[PDB]
């Protein structure tokens, strides 16, 4: 079939891509720059697909084939093609190259591709045996570059276990395997492992256990954008549950900003799900441009009816939505947070009153927030004032909630401080740009 | 100049009959009925009946459909005769003429396909525009969003290659009429105010209504300095404003600062906006918008004004004026903070330095995000 | 012709006279300006409102104290305007850097 | 200086946003007249930033 003929052409091109990866993989090993591998690993997701049984076999029959037990491990785990007419022997290793054991980078990369194919073939156990052996191979392997290729495999290995749906067997493994990186000052591997570990933690709701891990651990600042985006969501999820709302918004909005423009329709879907609920509990009505966007249109529409409820403050409407769309929230892992809101709808209206009125008499606050009595609002009016949702002072001598007299900020020191955080980053960007500058060793 | 096919009057009437309160209107039905029988709109009638559950007149339909069939056959016979005997000029007109009969009969799909075939064979640039304009009217008549935008792109591209001024003037209104219905009011102000002096597309709307739309959209769009020089003192806009006094009162009342009549004149402009087939989905966003400009305009001069004064100036009670400012202030639309204990409203208009500094943070923050977003990428 | 033109006069004679009266003061009860111009407080209440709105003279009408707060408009501090325009400028260059980044 | 640097950014946008690739290495050598790209660029930044930093530090 011409589809497979293009497939083998895709195979050879993927082999050429792999050969490009392996040649670059073998490039970095002798190129003295782990950066090269990152390019091959970013093509990994792209080359992750577009492969069937003939691909790996010819790759493993093209790569490796040193008569090493490696062939004996993944060849049986993947269906072998017949005596195909186009037997393009794709051996980047010729003789001595075959005789030389495959570098830990390419072998895992090829094995990961098998692992990926194992995932692509749903063979998480053969991959399990493949992968842990991969790890059992790379567990001993202590190179500096393999840490990268190991990091990708880890999430896939976490992902193979991810489809295995245990996540506790790897809870310890990923928990210890992490410590191997940190004792190596390795950058990427520590980043990737932590995100997979945390996902493990939230998946069973051990927020207490998770909240600790972020407390002591330090996420490498010079981390992959992809990872930095992930860690920010998980921390945002933890912070939101821990009742540290204000920080939950700052990280989640920052986590969202780091999403890979338009590749991950999902991640943006879930984060917006928490951001909208996270924002509501803090007293801020979320952005409307969200709910109209294409990808998040139907996904967040369930939350849409909510945010309309809070602004309306019609508790009967709010309960009605939880009754209907509430059950769906649980799967999203948000029902609990919404339950907080049901007894927190009064805050925003307290903010709306403080944002527009500046000296509203308490009795008036009760009228405009549906509070039962003028006395009841006082605790709520102060509480919102107490909790820093307002900036007002309740003069109980005559029952009026005065708002703070706003000042000319430009004559105070706020603008200078805002410029400092800005200039420090701007200067740092110059140093980071200049600092690397990667002048290749003049050829 | 261009034909009245399709009649946007029919579309406006049908929307009016769709509205709840006017669903039972009889005068609208006669006019809608009058248009169908006069132009023999058989298929539209079916669509008209199904949407509004009207009863189809079999005798009219059969005579109409037979008339449509015999007329369609006659065009079919003429088309065949032209193909065998005449050149591409006659077949081009024959195909072009054929579609125009689909338009008059309400066949949306059939009209679109027939025209699209013609555009394939049409050669002269002048004729290409006319078919393009023909699709646009179909889109507006049916509110077919995708058609109106696609052809508009065609019109702009076709005109740029070779475009006489007459057609470019026409497209300016056609672009504008769409803009009102997509709630892009500012661009409607630019488009209309550039063609009020030379409105030559009488097909879409009568001249009194084109100026009436311009005053409606001009006020929501232009700031006071631009409104004064381009509308209030505009030659043509005033002249037809002597035949539509109600709009005249509406436009001036905002400029002269007679707010009591402006709100009352806005009630008429809200009711009228409810009936137009174009300003229907946007009437609520409109009456809210002019409301905010009215308040913000008055507060622009007074720092702290007694809410009692504002209610009297606006001819509305103290309670309502307190309420709306509350609802508008919250959405960050009006710069003011209502003091309910003393009923005094104090303005919080930023100083020039404050707003510029605030803009440096916002515009600066957006830029630094990008630099950080990029910086991470290239540095790998 | 005598009404439209003459009315424009009185409506202008009031401005040139309002400015002359307010020239000394820096805060004057809207009640007092009425006495000098010999016009009802409502008439001067409005004409002041439109004059401030139209950028005729730089002031503000506070209603809770019945005073017109005359003041001086400080410049638009060009430096910040050159920065804001520059930010957009550099915002466009950072975009064109992206395209160079795509080449990889 | 901020006004003068602004006009120099306009060219920087035009000079970069052009990015014409008709032998760009030759483009970078056929347009050398001590002009927009950098020389009249941050050269001013150093002057502008040195003058402010010294002035500010003296102020404090």
């Amino acid at each position: 079939a011409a589809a497979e003929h293009s497939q083998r052409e895709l195979d050879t091109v993927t082999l050429e891509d792999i050969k490009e990866h392996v040649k670059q993989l073998e490039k970095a090993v002798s190129g003295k720059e782990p950066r090269f591998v990152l390019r091959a690993l970013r093509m990994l997701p792209s080359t992750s697909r577009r492969l069937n049984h003939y691909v790996l076999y010819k790759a493993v029959q093209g790569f490796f084939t040193s008569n090493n037990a490696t062939r004996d491990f993944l060849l049986p785990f993947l269906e072998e093609p017949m005596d195909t007419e186009a037997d393009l022997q794709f051996r980047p290793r010729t003789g001595k190259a075959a005789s030389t054991p495959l570098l830990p980078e390419v072998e895992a990369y090829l094995q990961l591709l098998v692992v990926i194919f194992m995932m692509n073939s749903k063979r998480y156990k053969e991959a399990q045996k493949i992968s842990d052996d991969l790890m059992q191979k790379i567990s001993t392997q202590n190179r500096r570059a393999l840490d990268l290729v190991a990091a990708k495999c880890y999430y896939y290995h976490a992902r193979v276990y991810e489809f295995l749906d245990k996540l506790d067997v790897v809870r310890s493994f990923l928990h210890a395997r992490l410590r191997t990186a940190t004792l190596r000052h390795d950058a990427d591997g520590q980043a990737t492992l932590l995100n997979l570990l945390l996902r493990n933690y939230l998946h069973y709701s051990l927020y207490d256990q998770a909240e600790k891990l972020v407390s002591k651990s330090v996420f490498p600042e010079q981390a992959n954008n992809n990872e930095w985006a992930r860690y920010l969501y998980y921390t945002g999820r933890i912070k939101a549950i821990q009742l540290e709302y204000s920080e939950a918004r700052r990280t989640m909005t920052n986590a969202l900003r780091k999403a890979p423009q338009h590749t991950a329709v999902g991640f943006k879907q879930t984060v917006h799900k928490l951001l909208i609920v996270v924002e509501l509990l803090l007293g801020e009505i979320p952005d409307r441009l969200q709910f109209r966007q294409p990808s998040l249109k139907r996904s967040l529409m369930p939350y849409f009816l909510l945010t309309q409820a809070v602004r309306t403050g019609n508790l009967a409407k709010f309960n009605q939505v939880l009754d209907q769309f509430g059950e769906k929230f649980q799967a999203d892992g948000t029902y609990t947070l919404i339950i907080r809101l049901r007894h927190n709808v009064i805050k925003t209206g307290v903010r709306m009153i403080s944002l527009s009125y500046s000296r509203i008499s308490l009795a008036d606050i009760a009228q405009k927030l549906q509070l039962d009595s003028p006395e009841d609002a006082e605790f709520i009016v102060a509480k919102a004032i107490r909790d820093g949702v307002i900036e007002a002072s309740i003069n109980h001598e005559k029952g009026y909630v005065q708002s703070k007299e706003m000042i000319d900020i430009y004559s105070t020191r706020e603008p200078q401080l805002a410029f400092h955080q800005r200039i420090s980053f701007c200067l740092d960007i110059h140093n980071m740009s200049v600092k690397a500058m990667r002048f290749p060793p003049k050829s | 100049g261009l034909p009245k096919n399709p009649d946007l009057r029919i579309a406006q009437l049908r929307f009016l009959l769709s509205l709840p309160e006017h669903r039972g209107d009889a005068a609208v039905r006669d006019e809608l009925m009058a248009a169908v029988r006069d132009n023999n709109m058989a298929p539209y009638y079916e669509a008209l009946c199904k949407s509004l559950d009207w009863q189809i007149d079999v005798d009219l339909l059969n005579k109409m459909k037979k008339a449509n069939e015999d007329e369609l056959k006659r065009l079919d016979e003429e088309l065949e005769d032209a193909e065998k005997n005449l050149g591409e000029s006659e077949i081009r007109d024959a195909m072009m003429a054929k579609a125009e009969y689909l338009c008059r009969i309400g066949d949306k799909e059939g009209a679109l396909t027939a025209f699209r075939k013609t555009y394939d064979k049409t050669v002269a640039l002048g004729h290409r525009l006319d078919i393009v304009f023909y699709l646009l009217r179909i889109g507006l008549f049916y509110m077919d969003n995708d058609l109106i935008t696609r052809n508009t792109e065609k019109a702009k591209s076709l005109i740029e290659e070779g475009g006489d001024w007459d057609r470019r003037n026409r497209l300016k209104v056609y672009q504008g009429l769409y803009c009102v219905a997509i709630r892009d009011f500012k661009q409607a102000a630019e488009l209309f105010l550039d063609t009020v002096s030379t409105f030559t597309s009488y097909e879409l709307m009568d001249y009194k209504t084109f100026v009436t739309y311009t005053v409606y959209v001009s006020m929501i769009a232009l700031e006071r300095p631009d409104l004064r020089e381009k509308v209030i003192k505009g030659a043509e806009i005033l002249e037809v404003l002597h035949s539509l006094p109600a709009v005249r009162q509406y436009l001036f009342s905002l400029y002269e600062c007679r707010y009591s009549v402006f709100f009352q004149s806005l009630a008429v402009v809200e009711q009228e906006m409810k009936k137009d087939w174009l300003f229907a989905p946007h009437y609520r966003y409109y009456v809210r918008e002019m409301r905010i400009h009215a308040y913000s305009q008055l507060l622009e001069s007074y720092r702290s004004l007694t809410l009692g004064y504002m209610a009297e100036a606006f001819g509305v009670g103290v309670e309502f004026i307190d309420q709306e400012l509350s609802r508008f202030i919250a959405a960050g639309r009006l710069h003011c903070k209502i003091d309910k204990v003393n009923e005094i409203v104090e303005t919080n208009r930023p100083d020039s330095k404050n707003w510029q500094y605030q803009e440096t943070i916002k515009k600066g923050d957006l830029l630094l995000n990008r630099v950080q977003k990029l910086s991470r990428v290239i540095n790998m | 012709i005598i009404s439209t033109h003459l009315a424009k006069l009185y409506d202008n004679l009031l401005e040139q006279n309002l400015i002359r009266v307010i020239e000394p003061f820096s805060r004057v009860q809207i009640e007092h300006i009425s006495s000098l111009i010999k016009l009802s407080k409502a008439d001067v209440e409005r004409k002041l409102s439109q004059m401030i709105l139209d950028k005729k003279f730089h002031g503000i009408l506070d209603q809770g104290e019945g005073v017109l707060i005359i003041f001086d408009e400080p410049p638009v501090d060009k430096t910040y305007e050159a920065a804001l325009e520059t930010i957009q400028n550099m915002s466009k260059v950072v975009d064109s850097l992206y395209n160079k980044a795509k080449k990889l | 200086v901020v006004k003068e640097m602004l006009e120099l950014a306009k060219n920087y946008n035009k000079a970069v946003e052009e990015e014409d690739k008709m032998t760009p290495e030759q483009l970078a050598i056929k347009n050398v007249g001590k002009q927009d790209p950098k020389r009249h660029l941050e050269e001013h930044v150093d002057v502008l930033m040195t003058s402010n930093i010294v002035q500010c530090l003296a102020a404090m």
């Binding site: 701007c426 960007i429 110059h430 | 290239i378 | 850097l97 | 660029l41």
Partner: peptide, 30 residues
């Protein structure tokens, strides 16, 4: 701050131009 930003965008542009330079020469070597 405006001085700092200009020096940063110029810095990034110089790394992107350089990243292209060595990379392009990298491929062109083959």
């Amino acid at each position: 701050y405006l001085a700092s930003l200009i020096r940063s965008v110029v810095a990034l542009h110089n790394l992107i131009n350089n990243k292209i330079a060595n990379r392009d020469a990298e491929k062109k070597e083959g």
